[PDB]
């Protein structure tokens, strides 16, 4: 039963994979689970890279705005 | 000069404020964007535009069923294909189609599994030859 | 080391071991591809200077946008590390110059949009003819069609009421080139359905109803009827005389 993001995302990946194999009309032929593994590896790598980039961009913009506000306050005080 | 620099940074300050405001929207979304990007990456290499649209709409409905957030205006090129990469692909000789750009981004973002190309026209053989030079 | 596998054979034979461990990508021509290609061909054959100016303007605009993004990134990185004020002044002056360059370069769009609206009918007719030829290609293995052959047919049209004249020459030349690739029954199929397509696009709705009645009575599916006007088009009178005299081949 779903408690965190992890259970929801693994359920959504499993259910989408089942739907995709259902549309393809594989019939009685076996379904290759290679697509699921490839998608999962791509998901973890891409979410790690995107989280790193987004956190770096956020702290970058935050320190830029902080420096600009500090300079504005220093100019206003003087 | 400092006063002029402060006064001229109105647009930059507005953009920074908009980015700070939309950081919550992006962080509420990032998992869903990564899921749909990876599904594009590993599922619709070998599908036409109609099948891609049907798969995408049923994926969007199913993803909204489990209540995880995603963009109402999400696109593959707007998320994975960068401006420098798009410039390089267009100057190599690729067409301007969104389908071709999506497939090109799918092919060049595969550092794990080798990509397979079914190009009847034999156009991106010389496009990729242009990309890697000599 | 990076490996790429290329194949020019659609619907080939990929082994299951190879199929299961690669990122299989198809590459087919869609509506947008043929429409953009035919717009480019007709523009570079009609007004070559206009097409060259348009493509140079597009390349300049995207390069200027890339330079603007890179300049914004450099400005942000430079201010993050803190003479300097003069550098920031030069950067924002260059950014303003880029912005006014875009503003001055974004004034040729209405002519391009008018050309798009003018030649959209040629684009849609071309993609419809290509769809019909692909239908022929999947009816039998010998009747396949390549996009390069179709584009070379356009080049032959342009080498050999103006847009209507281009469309007329297009239909005549594409029939005269791709009739020889089909047998007699598909020759009749292609000729009659293409004359039907032209007359449906050009003439009115009563003409469409009349032609549906003609094809239906020739198909033994629809009986009777026609909605023939009193001041008939002379060809329709001959066609109804032919079908009433049971001269089907005529």
Give the helix level of chain A as a range of percent.
over 70%
What share of the residues of chain A does DSSP label as strand, in percent? under 5%
The biggest sheet of chain A, with number of strands, parallel, antiparallel or mixed sense and barrel status, is: none
Radius of gyration of chain A: 23 Å
Shape of chain A: rod-shaped
- Determine the N-to-C terminus distance of chain A: 61 Å
Topology:
This is part of a larger assembly, with three copies of chain A.
Chain A (H helix, E strand, L loop, with lengths): L4 H19 L10 H44 L1
Keywords:
part of a larger assembly; 3 chains; 78 residues; mainly alpha; 81% helix; Dynein heavy chain, cytoplasmic (chain B); motor protein; Enzyme
Summarize this entry quickly:
It is classed as motor protein. This is part of a larger assembly, with 3 copies of chain A. With about 80 residues, the first copy, chain A, is an all-alpha fold.
What does this structure look like?
Chain A: It comes from Saccharomyces cerevisiae (strain ATCC 204508 / S288c) (Baker's yeast). With 78 residues, the first copy, chain A, is mostly helical. Helices cover 81% and strands 0% of the residues of chain A. Chain A contains two helices and no strands. The first copy, chain A, has helices spanning 5-23, 34-77. Chain A starts with a helix and ends with a helix. Strand 1 (115-118) of chain B pairs parallel with strand 2 (23-26) of chain C, so a sheet runs across the interface.
